[PDB]
Every structure is written in structure tokens, then in C-alpha cells.
Structure 1
Amino acid sequence: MNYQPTPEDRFTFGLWTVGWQGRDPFGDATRRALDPVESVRRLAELGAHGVTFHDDDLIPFGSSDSEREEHVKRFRQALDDTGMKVPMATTNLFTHPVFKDGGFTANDRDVRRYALRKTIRNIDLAVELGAETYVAWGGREGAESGGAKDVRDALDRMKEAFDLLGEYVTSQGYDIRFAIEPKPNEPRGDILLPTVGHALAFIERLERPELYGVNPEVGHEQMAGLNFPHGIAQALWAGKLFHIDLNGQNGIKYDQDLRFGAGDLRAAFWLVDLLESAGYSGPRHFDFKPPRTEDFDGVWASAAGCMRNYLILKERAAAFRADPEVQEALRASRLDELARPTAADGLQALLDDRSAFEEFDVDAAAARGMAFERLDQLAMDHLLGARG
């Protein structure tokens, strides 16, 4: 009756996660670098399904086409020896000083062109490795001051970039879709497309909207004090949840990247409840950082905890929905009615329906209790395994 993960659970990790050396804005690294091959081997042993990477994680910046080839080959052999897959890949358009003002929206045009070329080159490699989703996190797209960036022009440049990438994949005949990852701030004072909503609205203005979805991250939405499960529900509603990044965050402050389960525990429960209920079948990707206080043993314990926590919550959420007492409580709170159309009878019928206004007893309706507190306590008991 434990919680051991298997590749069937689709848990994935970025190379940059367990490979984070611990360098923060106020301190040097506390851990030596990991060879991508060792990370692949270590994660496979923990039960992971696959890994993800930024170009610069796999092939050091400025590498020769041959060195590049050696790096890819070694990586490939490790995937072969372990059965690990690579479901997603992304580009590093934030580390090098050249991207200090952005990649796709840098004020310098020559920088923008370079950003597009670097991305296109990695898209080819991502397809080669079997990736189905290509993520784009515009970490440097934004500003610290108001006159430094004209946002309308920036959005034109952002759209131009994404349309060109869409023109490329469709002309190469690749079966890869894009996922935009929003973040409200950090490293820039304010980042463009700050939340899942802004990203979703942006996509509807692209030439080929069908190729783009979102890759929301638990901590990012929480940095704006937003309800993550709700944001995900809207993304699923729009049919745009192509991928998802899981981790923990303790409120509005810098991006902590704690292991999944840490941070807002109740939000994690409602998240798992939703993903499992909605039948999300994409990867359960962890974009986290084992704290710099830890040594390598601590790194792997942190990675294992991510998966363990998701499995415990999945169990608790399933028991919650399957509890007949909860099913009756959901009806007591009228969740069944929320699912029924307000007016399937039509506009005219509604306007002619005296029970809807003229003869509506507003006071009687008002006095009805929603019974939400009883339902929420049942949810609490289930989460804590306190159903007596």
C-alpha cells in the first residue's frame, strides 16, 4: 500500500532541475555539475518516465558542430540504455548576456533574428529525439522601466516570432506543438504574457492558433496570488493544456521552485483532483530546484519526493470523489445543477418564463444554504486520511 512510481505515471524532469548547482543571486554554487548521462541514469532508477532539456543544458554554448554531435550521441546512448524518453524540449533565451533585453522582443533587431535561429536549430534536434511539445519561456521578454518597452510593438514582435516558428514546423512537416509558459516577473521587473490568461488570449491572435497551447507552472501563477487549479481549469476548458510544470511556492515572493507537494498543499490536492478527473494524459513534469542546502543524496530525495507527493494526492483525491458521502454532499451543494444549462429552452422561453423573475421568490432562494463548509471539511478529512 505504498507509493512507488513507474514510467507508466509519466513523471518527467528537466536536466536543469536535479542538475541545479545552487547558485543564487546572493551566493556561489554548493554542488558540482552533473553530467546529463548520470542524471538520466539516476532518474530512471527512481522511476521517472523521461527528461527534458534546454539546448544549452545538453550542448554547451558555443560548441562546435562536432562536439555537439558527441554530446547528442552520448545522451542518446543513455536514453537507449535506460528506456527514458524526451517528451519536451525548450530553448535557452535567457542566460547569455546577449539576451539581457529579451530574445524574441529584444529592442535590437539583430538579436531577435539570432534568437529565432537558435530556436529553430533546437527544434530540429527536439524532433530528432522524439519530443512532442516545444516549450517557450520568454524569461527576458519584459522590462524594469516604462519607456524601455512599447508593449504593443513588443507583442507584434512576439507574434511575428511565433508565426515564423509555426511556418517552419509546418513546412518541415514536423509533428510538434508549441506551449507558451507564462511567468509574471523575475528575472525582469515585469514579464510579457504574465499569466495563463494573457498567454491564452495571445495565442488566439496567431496565424495558426491550433499549434499553440500553454505550459503553466504552479509557482508562477502563485507569484501573482492566483488560484492555480482555476487557471488550469480555464486552460483545459479552452483545450490548450499541452503540458504542465509542477513544483511548490510559498506565496508571493521570488520563485522558490520547491519540490511538488511543498508550498500550498491544498492547492496541490485540488490540482491533482482536476488533472486526474479531466483525464490529462500529458507528462507530469517537475520544474524544481533541490534547495542549495542539500548534497547529492538530498537532490535525489527531493526528486523522489516530487513523485511520491503526486501519488499520495492522486489516491486521496480518488477516494474523495469515490466516497458516496461526498457524492451526496456534492448534490447537497448543487454541483449537479451547475452542470445543467441555465436556459436550454432558449432566450424567448426565458423572457416568457414568469418563474424566472416576476414570480421568483428571491427570499426563499436566498435563504438556501450552500453547504460548502461541510463539503470542504470532507475534502480536508480525505486529504489528511482522517475519515472516521
Structure 2
Amino acid sequence: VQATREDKFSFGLWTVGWQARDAFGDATRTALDPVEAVHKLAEIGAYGITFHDDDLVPFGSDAQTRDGIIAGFKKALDETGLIVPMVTTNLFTHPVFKDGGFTSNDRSVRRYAIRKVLRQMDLGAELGAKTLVLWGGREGAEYDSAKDVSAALDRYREALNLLAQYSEDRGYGLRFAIEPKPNEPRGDILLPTAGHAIAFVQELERPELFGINPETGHEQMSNLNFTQGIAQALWHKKLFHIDLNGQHGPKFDQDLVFGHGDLLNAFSLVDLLENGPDGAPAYDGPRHFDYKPSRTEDYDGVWESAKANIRMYLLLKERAKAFRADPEVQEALAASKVAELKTPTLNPGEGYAELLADRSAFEDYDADAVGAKGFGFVKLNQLAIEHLLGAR
């Protein structure tokens, strides 16, 4: 298959740029030039690139340096036609953030973290970014008595409310996406799942400007069903962005190519995002890959893995489409009553009193008879896998 700008595949500069220095070893690859990343990505079919402030401008660069870098990067986007759909800020690498950015126990660190983000918001707006992703990687703790969670949530909220105020006042029109993660690098991270991130956002001052950026591996690190979690995020209308990658259950964050981890879940996910209501996708934003080319690879391996992500997504889409289009699947869906869940439980205008008066809903209901009918779910599931396998 072939990727189009209409596919909206984006990559973080820190992905193909990952030098492969893990917690147990040194880097196996040399640094990638931002400008080269831009030309290579354009070439493999991506429509946009994302970056952390510190991925593009080395922490501590003077404005002369800083300015120079931005200018060149800007030219590259220009020549290639790539856009910057999202930007983020690094609030986890520097030792100052060892206890967090926004929720560090140290007050001075909190002030500093806000400033770092405001600045990145400025660059984002200049480059045309529409979404600010916030990954609070260091917000959390290793020991329960070290962090007052309530105070931490107040401080997270305080910081976010200021960011929305500024964006709205400067007219940047940004949307903010909170990225949930259960652990790593902190023992436990605040807002561990898509669920906790959504509940939190609901308490902000201008909640309509806030949503989440869920990551495949993050939810899988707690053994949760990523597809079901996205379905919930979509129900709430809080899916502002998405990070796609692969993981093999609860272990360190692997960041494999999308679909190289839980393949069956990767398939139900593409199905959910693409076979939305009335043909059209259920999701319209970037399909962003936040993965890492394995430590054992060289730059050849790097570009290969970049293309594998696109490839995986397009192969899955194709099968998800074929799945839904199959009259036998259509028949199995009917037998399993999947669409019957869309019919309200209650009749039009029916309330508690009418329901209480309906003898068929209780007094005269044959639970035993209904309890014996099968749902035909294994059969429908088998049909889906055969489509995935290209056997149908």
C-alpha cells in the first residue's frame, strides 16, 4: 500500500532520532540531524513531524544558536511540505525535574517548569501546531509518603489553567492533550490511565480545551484493553491525539513498531478509528507513531522501522475494511446482536412507572429460556482473525 498526506502519519523527532542508549548501555547510533529527519520522513510518506523543545534546540542554547536552528528547521518543512501538528516540552530529562515539573515538591522547580512550557507554546504557535501534548513523566513517586497526591493534583491544575489562559489570550487556539502513563520512570506516575487523565481534565477551568493523548503501550503496561479505552475516550470526545506503538504486556515500555506487540488489539483499534459512523473515520487527528527503532539496528534499520509503522497501519486498515464489508461477518454481527445495543433499553417516553407496569420485563420474563441462547461470539471472532490473516 501507499501512504498519502490524507493518512496523516506523523513521527516524533525523538523516535527515528533515538540513539539507543537504554538504562543498561551506551548509544549504538549517532545523532540524527533534524533537517535530515525532515527529508527522510517526507520521503517515507509522513505528513508531519513533532518534537520536544529539547529535541530541536539543545537545552541551554543561546538565542543566536536557538534562532539559527529554528530557521533551518523551518526551511526544511518549507521545501518538503511537512507540517508540525503537535509540539511538546521536555519536563523529564534534566536533573532539576527528578521529582517532576508541575508537581515537584520544590516550588522553584514548578515556576521554572511553567516557563519552559510557555516558551515551547510560543514556538509551537509560530510553526502552526494545533496541539500541545503534556507527558508528566516525572510527576509521581517511588514512596507513598513522599507525595501528597491531592496537593499534586491542585498544582497540576493550577499550571494547566494558566497555560489555557495564556493560549486563549494570545489567540494561539491550541488544544492540550494530557498523556497518561502508569509508571516508568517514576515508581508510579500521577494520572496512570486514560480513565484517570479524562476524569482530571473534567475538573479544569476550561475543560473544552483539554483532552488526552493515550499511548498503545502505556495502557498495555497495566494489561488494559487499549481499543476499549480509546472507545471510551471517543465516547467522551476527549481523544485529541494518539500515540501508536507496540508493547508485550506489563514490562518496561518497549515502544515497538505499531502492531508488533498485541497484534489482535492493533487490528480492533484500526477498525475502531477507521470504520466510524457512516463510512468515515471515528477519529480525525494525526496517527502519530511514538516508537523506537530497536537498539540492535543501524540507520538502515531505522528507516525500515519507520516505514513498517505505516505499512502495519495500512495493511490492518485494508483488512478491517474487508471484515466489515463481508456479508458473512454482517450475518454473524446480526446473530450476535452487536447492533441491538444501540437500541435504547427504554421505549420512547417510557420511565420508571411504565417499566414497573411492564410484566414482560420481570414478572412474566423467562430468564432461564433467554439464559440458554448462545451469542455466537467465538464464530464472529474467528471471522475477524481470518480476515486479519488474509484467509477470507
TM-score range, shorter chain: over 0.9
TM-score (norm 2): 0.97
Give ranges in structure 1 of 5+ residues lacking alignment.
none
Alignment of 1:1-388 (within 5 A): 3-278=1-276, 279=281, 280-344=283-347, 345-387=350-392
Give the distance between the partners of 1:352 and 1:167, measured in 2 at CA.
Answer: 53
Deviation string for 1:250-298 (max 9, x for gaps)?
1110000001110000000000000012321100000000001000000
Structure 2 counterpart SS, 1:147: helix
RMSD of aligned C-alpha atoms?
Answer: 0.7
**Deviation of residue 174 (structure 1)?**
1.4
Other structure's SS at 1:185 match: coil
Runs of 4+ in 1 over 6 A off after TM superposition: none
Cα distance between partner residues in 1 of 2:160 and 2:53: 18
Instruction: Give distance in 2, aligned partners of 1:21 and 1:86.
Output: 22
Question: Matched residue pairs, number?
Answer: 385
Q: What do the CA deviations read for 1:97-129 (whole angstroms, capped 9, x no partner)?
A: 000000000000000000000000000110110
SS at match of 1:85: coil
Q: Identity over the aligned pairs, expressed in percent?
A: 68
Aligned equivalents of 2:167, 2:374: Cα separation in 1: 54
Deviates more, 1:223-232 or 1:343-352: 343-352
TM-score, normalising length from structure 1? 0.98
Take 1:335 and 1:295, find their aligned partners in 2: how far apart are those partners? 46
2:235 counterpart letter in structure 1: W
Q: Which amino acid aligns with 2:9?
A: F
The Cα offsets for residues 22-72 of structure 1, whole Å up to 9 and x where unpaired, read as 000000000000000000100111011110000001111001112111010
Is 300-309 or 348-357 further displaced after alignment?
Answer: 348-357
Amino acid at match of 2:372: A
Query: How far is the alpha carbon of 1:340 from its aligned partner?
Result: 0.5
Letter of the aligned partner of 1:186 in structure 2? E
